[PDB]
Design a protein around this nucleic acid. Structure first.
Ligand SMILES: Nc1ncnc2c1ncn2[C@@H]1O[C@H](COP(=O)(O)OP(=O)(O)O)[C@@H](O)[C@H]1O
Ligand code: ALF
Ligand SMILES: [Mg+2]
Ligand SMILES: [Mg+2]
Length: 1009
RNA sequence: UUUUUUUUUU
């Protein structure tokens, strides 16, 4: 017997902001006429709405948003505009312009019927070429049979318009994203057939059998895994596992709303996968989980691997740009950024069973774009499952967008978080701001009193609103504090109060950007208490610090040391930093704005939304109880937006339009009209016109081979087009690194707090070239060799030269990626050989010279002309300054060998600044930095209606005739990437003469300079 | 704290 044994001042600013580059594509509606037209519209249609103004920035860099919405009965539609400007006047003009332009394109208002206003011409710049060079031009023109304008037969040089010297002439089904259920011999993650080893005799059922046996074995026998299961069962979301799985199983789309920390991201993917595994079907599951941020995808993937007692690479993986650990091909979970999933769409999503779109409230352009796609995909493929998740969403709006889908409400949280507002913080600390700080703030305010605009009820001071529940002293003190500026005194007092409680735990401080993070770090490190490394370690957290320093925020500190993390919103959602007990929220966020009509970028520090505050708060109360010190008044909190405005509303759309066409999803307008919030129609029009003019789209708005290639590169299309010519000219390596530098906000050189300019050893990297691009190239060439010697050597080198290590790495990784992608498109290795730049050469350098010339194409229309000292002139002689960070910036009376600079960015501060600058020669501008080359009065050749040249008009026409040939060359290259270094002879000679033309001195024949 | 750097891409 027995069972075991039983047998069988500042005038320039407004003028720079009023500049309007694109009225001609928007009905001739421009800055100076839009407000008046809108006033006429408002009078005709009895519209009482006025501009809503929002202050932006600290008091010392105050700007404004202006918003206006108009309901149009005829369309049953509200048209909204939202724009920024240095003051209310510029913001309201830009706002009115957007609104009028939208109304024009929707046929509610007419085109403007008058002529637009097109003085003081700039002095002509002399240009002369050798007879030898001119002969080569003639040979190329003959060889390519190019039409050339003959200015002998150009009569009127009196008082008429300039005459063109270019003839711009060339010479020669919309699908759904593929999907399928799981299939043998297919890797879902790479979208390719496997063909190797043992999915030869191995079916998906056999795999499933193996996974179930293995999991069931571990469930009984693996103590660590057993413990993790016990832990997991106690999470708030476990109470709804079955209900959630049933909803997912029976519906193509589901929404999960659950509190911060309740278990959405760590658990749901496991619930789905384990439900397949335990039922003998583990091989028929493959789950993508998108996160908005890189740190979230990586961090949560690491956690989920640990909950399963595995190494990344088995059932759990991640993929972010430059860094992937892919899981096994069947029965797996891949965490990624939204952008990665959008790039995977090109190859189809065959074999994906479930897509979890996490933190779906973010409203970045990628997330909204993905929602459009996925809604169409579930309609076409009703067996696909999509799961949308957030703590912080309007479920009704998302449910409606998806045709009404299930909404699952998860109650509870892991641990409580005690919340305090500014009043509470002042009262508990007995804070009073110092005499010094009060005087300094009135001093900055009293010089605003001269430049001040009307203070409207939209600029209430919510620090002077407080209930009498608080002491009179608390109220007086609060009323002394700026809402715009961060009081480091208050922060210190709060940190001391936290210390006095004797509660161990890390402190997480949310700040809008780098500048505040590093200023507060310095401030704290200078104190006796917080500067003592035996008591505190202060860690920054920002996207642009080294990867290893980001990882330090998650890690412990020594015994008795308190961790203070000073972080941007990269730590706002998704992540568990396991030792957080206290959150301090400054209640701000930073946006990068772009106004299309004037080409101005700016950074805006704005009030965070209630959504942002709730996510930030939710970094505590995850592993133990916590505290959230929200540094705004209770009345300010009530006045915060529920959410920040969607990115789709304020971003150029041309990259997304290319993606729409690449993925063959049909019409750009139609696709974007299906967005959760459709973008304003003027931005859609701008995008289409840009892509047509760049030749990415043909006459039928279909993708050209150039457009298809550019849609696949992770850079601005204009930089992509520059790369194609780079390849043709044998300098793709240099072009890639410059494109990469032009595509990151991460800065090359470090400057101290309040440092006015680069040090000499940093400027010296430019050598003789007067070029930020060269300085960056040279820095990269040196850094590259130090990186090869190891981490210590790399860091030491960066400290020695004042380089930002993380920037060097990202520029390199992006550059290598671009080159790999060009190789994949068929361009030969030989066109992207490294060429070391020697910055110390004073004079011509053929490979560098053509490289910098091609920047004029990639960064067009950003050409400026040096006037004196830091002052330059941009298009149509608008004033600007050389950015303080440029190697070319000096307060002394510098003169440059040539006055022309190409630049990466035109930034709006208290002044307009040009940033990322390279000196370029006149022919480089004429050839590559121009759309029009016209003959003006008195034989002056005028480029783009403002750069004047004293050059033989006949010669300018000959040079100009090369520009359409260069476009044809790009067509030839994109038709056959593999043949670009063995061109038919007339194109090979074009390449040669253009190299000659781009030599630095080629326009200086017999000229002193 | 006298504004170089919110994010993100095969
Ligand atoms: N690294 C970690 N250490 C300890 N606990 C963790 C860690 N990561 C997650 N958790 C636990 O799992 C819970 C759920 O995390 P997660 O699924 O990321 O929450 P949500 O997606 O709902 O915000 C956390 O509240 C915490 O209790
Ligand atoms: F909802 Al979470 F971290 F993803 F709070
Ligand atoms: Mg989550
Ligand atoms: Mg002349």
């Amino acid at each position: 017997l027995g069972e075991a044994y039983r047998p069988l001042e500042q005038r320039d600013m407004n003028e720079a902001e009023a500049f309007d580059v694109n009225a001609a594509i928007h009905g001739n509606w421009t800055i100076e006429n839009a407000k008046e037209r809108l006033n006429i519209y408002k009078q005709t249609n009895n519209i009482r709405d006025d501009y809503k103004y929002t202050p932006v920035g600290p008091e010392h860099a105050r700007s404004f948003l202006a918003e206006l919405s108009i309901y149009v009965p005829a369309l049953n539609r509200t048209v909204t505009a939202r724009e920024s400007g240095s003051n209310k006047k510029s913001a309201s003009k830009s706002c009115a312009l957007s609104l009028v332009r939208q109304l024009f394109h929707l046929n509610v208002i007419e085109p403007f019927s008058g002529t637009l206003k097109k003085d003081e011409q700039l002095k002509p710049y002399p240009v002369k070429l050798s007879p030898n060079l001119i002969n080569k031009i003639d040979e190329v023109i003959k060889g390519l049979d190019l039409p050339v304008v003959n200015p002998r037969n150009i009569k009127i040089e009196l008082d008429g318009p300039p005459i063109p010297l270019i003839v711009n002439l060339s010479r020669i089904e919309s699908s759904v994203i593929p999907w399928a259920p799981p299939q043998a011999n297919w890797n879902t993650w790479h979208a390719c057939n496997i063909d190797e080893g043992e999915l030869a005799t191995t079916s998906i059922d056999d795999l499933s059998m193996d996974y179930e046996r293995s999991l069931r074995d571990r469930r009984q026998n693996d103590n660590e895994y057993r413990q993790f299961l016990e832990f997991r069962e106690k999470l708030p979301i476990a109470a709804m596992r079955s209900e959630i799985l049933t909803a997912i199983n029976d519906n193509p789309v589901v929404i999960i709303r659950g509190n911060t920390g309740c278990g959405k991201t760590t658990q749901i993917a496991q619930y789905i996968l384990d439900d397949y595994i335990c039922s003998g079907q583990g091989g028929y599951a493959n789950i993508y989980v998108t996160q908005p941020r890189r740190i979230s995808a990586i961090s949560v993937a690491e956690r989920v691997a640990r909950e399963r007692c595995e190494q990344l690479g088995d059932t759990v993986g991640y993929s972010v740009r430059f860094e992937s650990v892919f899981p096994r091909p069947y029965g797996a979970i891949l965490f990624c950024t939204v952008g990665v999933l959008l790039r995977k769409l090109e190859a189809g999503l065959r074999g994906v069973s479930h897509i979890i779109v996490d933190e779906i409230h973010e409203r970045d352009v990628n997330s909204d774009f993905l929602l459009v796609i996925l809604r169409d995909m579930v309609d076409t493929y009703p067996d696909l499952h999509v799961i949308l998740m957030s703590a912080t969403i309007d479920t009704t709006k998302f449910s409606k967008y998806f045709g009404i889908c299930p909404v699952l409400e998860v109650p509870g949280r892991a641990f409580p978080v005690q919340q305090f507002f500014l009043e509470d913080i002042i009262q508990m600390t007995d804070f009073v701001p110092s005499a010094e700080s009060r005087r300094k703030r009135k001093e900055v305010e009293d010089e605003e009193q001269l430049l001040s605009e009307d203070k409207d009820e939209a600029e209430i001071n919510y620090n002077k609103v407080c209930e009498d529940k608080y002491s009179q002293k608390t109220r007086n003190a609060m009323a002394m504090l700026s809402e715009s500026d961060v009081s480091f005194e208050l922060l210190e007092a709060l940190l001391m109060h936290i210390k006095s409680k004797n509660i161990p735990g890390a402190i997480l401080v949310f700040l809008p950007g780098w500048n505040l993070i590093f200023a507060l770090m310095k401030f704290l490190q200078n104190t006796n208490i917080f500067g003592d490394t035996s008591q505190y370690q202060i860690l920054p957290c920002h996207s642009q610090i080294p990867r290893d320093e980001q990882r330090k925020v998650f890690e412990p500190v020594p015994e008795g040391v308190t961790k203070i993390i000073l972080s941007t919103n990269i730590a706002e959602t998704s992540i568990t930093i396991d030792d957080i007990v206290f959150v301090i929220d400054i209640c701000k966020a930073r946006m990068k704005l772009f106004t299309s009509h004037n080409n101005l970028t700016s950074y805006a520090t704005v009030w965070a939304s209630k959504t942002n505050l709730e996510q930030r708060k939710g970094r505590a109360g995850r592993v133990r109880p916590g505290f959230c010190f929200t540094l705004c008044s209770r009345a300010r909190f009530q006045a915060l937006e529920d959410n920040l405005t969607p990115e789709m509303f304020r971003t150029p759309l041309h990259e997304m339009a290319l993606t729409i066409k690449l993925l063959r999803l049909g019409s750009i307008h139609h696709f974007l009209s299906k967005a959760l919030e459709p973008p304003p129609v003027d931005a859609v029009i701008e995008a289409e016109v840009l892509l047509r003019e760049m030749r990415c789209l043909d006459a039928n708005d279909e993708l050209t081979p150039l457009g298809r290639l550019l849609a696949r590169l992770p850079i601005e299309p204009r930089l992509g087009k520059m790369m194609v010519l780079g390849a043709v000219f044998g300098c793709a390596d240099l072009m890639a690194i410059m494109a990469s530098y032009s595509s990151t906000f991460s800065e090359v050189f470090s400057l101290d707090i309040g440092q006015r300019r680069l040090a000499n050893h940093q400027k010296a990297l430019s050598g003789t070239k007067c070029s930020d691009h060269v300085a960056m190239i040279v820095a990269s060439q040196m850094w590259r060799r130090e990186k090869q010697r190891g981490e210590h050597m790399e860091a030491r080198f960066c400290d020695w030269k004042g380089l930002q290590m993380s920037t060097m790495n990202v520029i390199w990784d992006a550059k290598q990626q671009l080159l790999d992608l060009l190789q994949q498109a068929g361009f030969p290795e030989e066109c992207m050989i490294s060429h070391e730049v020697d910055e110390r050469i004073d004079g011509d350098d053929p490979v560098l010279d053509v490289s910098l010339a091609l920047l004029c194409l990639g960064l067009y229309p950003n050409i400026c002309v040096h006037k004196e000292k830091r002052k330059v002139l941009t298009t149509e002689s608008k004033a600007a300054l050389l950015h303080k960070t440029s190697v070319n910036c000096s307060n002394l009376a510098v003169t440059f060998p040539y006055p022309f600079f190409v630049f990466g960015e035109k930034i709006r501060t208290r002044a307009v600044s040009c940033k990322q600058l390279s000196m370029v020669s006149p022919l480089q501008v004429i050839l590559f930095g121009s759309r029009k080359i016209d003959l003006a009065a008195n034989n002056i050749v005028r480029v783009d209606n403002w750069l004047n040249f004293d050059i033989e008009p006949e010669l300018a026409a000959k040079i100009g005739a090369l520009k359409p040939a260069l476009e044809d060359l790009i067509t030839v290259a994109c038709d056959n990437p593999s043949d670009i270094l063995r061109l038919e002879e007339p194109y090979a000679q074009l390449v040669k003469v253009v190299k000659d033309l781009c030599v630095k001195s080629a326009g200086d024949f017999g000229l002193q300079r």
